[PDB]
C-alpha cells in the first residue's frame, strides 16, 4: 500500500500530525519518532503527553503529512489511531527508544486507510 | 502578541494548516501564501477548491503550525477562519498575488486566538 516512493520521502521529512479534540478544535504536532511499523501501519513514541495523545484517545481520528519542501511534493495519510501503554506495540517502541531517546510514556499506532499526495 | 522570532518563522517556514470536516476527520495541508495581515490576523491566498477550504467554510476551526527543523523550534496558532470571494480582504489578496502567483480563487482570513510553543 505504502510504496517505496512514499517510504523514501517519509524517511527524510518531519511528520506533522493533525488530530481534533472533543470540541472540534484541530491540533498539529510534529512527531520526530513517527515511522513505519509495516506497510499499512505507522507507529510513534509518545514522549510529550500533550494534545495529540488526548485527541487520539478521545476519538482516534488522525492525518499525518510529510512535505518535501525542495519540490513541494509530499504524502498525507488518513487513518485511525490509538494510544497504548503496554503490550507488543509499546514494547517494540520501548526497545526502539533505547539509545535514541527516553522511555516512551506511551506508543501511538496509526492504521492507514487512505493516502493522498499534496494536490487538490 | 506576535513576537519577532514568531515573525521570523512565519516568513521563513512553511505554514502547515490543520482543519476538520463535518464528520470530525482532521485535514492538514501546506499553504505557501500564508502571511501576517497584522499582529492579530493571518491571511492566505486560496488557490484551490480543496479540503482545507471546504473545512474552513464548514466550521471555521483552524490551527496553523510553523516548524524550524534546524533549531527544533516552532509555533502553533489557534484561531477562527473564514473564506471570502469578494471585498476588501479579497482585493488585498488579489493585489498581493500580482507578480507572485495566479489570481486567487478566494482569500482565507484567520483571527488569531491563542499561541503555543513547540
Author numbering:
A (entry chain B): 1 to 120
B (entry chain A): 1 to 118
Question: Could you share sentences copied from the article?
Answer:
Hence, spy49_0662 was expressed with a 1.4 kDa C-terminal V5 epitope tag used for Western blotting followed by a His6-tag for immobilized metal ion affinity purification, and the resulting protein was coined as HupZ (heme utilization protein Z). The tagged HupZ is a small-sized protein previously shown to bind heme, and it exhibits a trace heme degrading activity in the presence of NADPH and cytochrome P450 reductase (CPR). This protein shares some protein sequence similarity to the members of the IsdG family.
We mutated His111 to probe its potential role in heme binding. The H111A variant was crystallized in the P6522 hexagonal trapezohedral space group, and its structure was solved and refined to 1.98-Å resolution. The UV–vis spectrum of the heme-bound H111A variant is nearly identical to wild-type HupZ. H111A in complex with heme was EPR silent, as observed in the binary complex of wild-type HupZ, indicating mutation of His111 did not lead to an observable change of the heme-center electronic structure.
